[PDB]
Design a binder for these strands. Sequence first.
RNA 1: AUCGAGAGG
DNA 2: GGAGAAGGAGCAGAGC
DNA 3: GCTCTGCTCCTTCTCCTTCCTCTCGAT
Lengths: 81, 215, 26
Amino acid sequence: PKDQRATTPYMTKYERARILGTRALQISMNAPVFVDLEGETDPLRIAMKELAEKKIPLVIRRYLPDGSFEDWSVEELIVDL
Amino acid sequence: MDQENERNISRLWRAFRTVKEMVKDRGYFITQEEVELPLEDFKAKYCDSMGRPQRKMMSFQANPTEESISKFPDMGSLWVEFCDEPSVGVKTMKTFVIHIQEKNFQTGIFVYQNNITPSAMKLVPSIPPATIETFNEAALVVNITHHELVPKHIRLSSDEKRELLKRYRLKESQLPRIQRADPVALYLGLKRGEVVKIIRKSETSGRYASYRICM
Amino acid sequence: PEQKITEIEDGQDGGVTPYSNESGLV
RNA sequence: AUCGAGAGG
DNA sequence: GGAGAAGGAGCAGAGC
DNA sequence: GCTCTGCTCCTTCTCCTTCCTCTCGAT
């Protein structure tokens, strides 16, 4: 369902790690960067900037024990940590 | 012990009290003063003038409370009786069975004096839908549910069970299990498929509820 | 959004599956 | 290639 | 070494 | 009353395993 999502609104350290990894990979594959490259050449550092600015174009499918799932977007998730 | 050595009688008395507590916990209308019967009063009421605990007189009928009924609509009457004969033979088992059949009790408890033969044991589950539970007077001397290591067990209704499984997206097989032969399961008289809510005190949180299903 | 660099031309024609690594750099 | 032995951590 | 699994054996009850 | 039909109550048997690394020296 769209609403009634029972999982946390915060981004977990595992979600953050994979988001940065997969985005950094795309960057290293010469994908378009959605933030200004302020002297940044390191895919990971670049990805972290996008994370801070919530520019990372991804959605986390959180699978629940019974096979069902809740889709949360990067923008929705609270990148605290 | 001897009639002089009333210790035997007091052991019986203890068992009697724990049965009253058990029956009460099962949801039957047992009062607090009914449970709290003094040894000398037990003797006055049940013990023969020659110092001979009239075990036959210790039998009684229990009736589910209004609250118990509202939660468990199908909960019927209970007959409790103690075996006068040291060793339980089918001749006495059948007698007990017949009593239930004639009185149409939903369930009955039969307490062993010393032991029971297989000839009787095989009869104990021969009258569906009525259920006969059995206990040994020795086992009943102490009510194990007052022990520090034993937490409060709550028998859940079929509605509570259904809601539980739905809520956690669980299948029956994914719950923690308890064997039907488990002292406490026997105390509660759990039937296969019933779920028990267990409330424990913890060190990481004040208390913690846990669910366990009867196998 | 206005960031045209976020939109894939092939994706416009349904040539990109945003939820598949087979498409790649979405 | 197996097989045993001697050691190191 | 200490399980567990398979097997022989020795008596309470029980039907003729 | 006496063998009988079950047991359940025992004794008497088969099975398994830090990590990792180095070298030599045999077949």
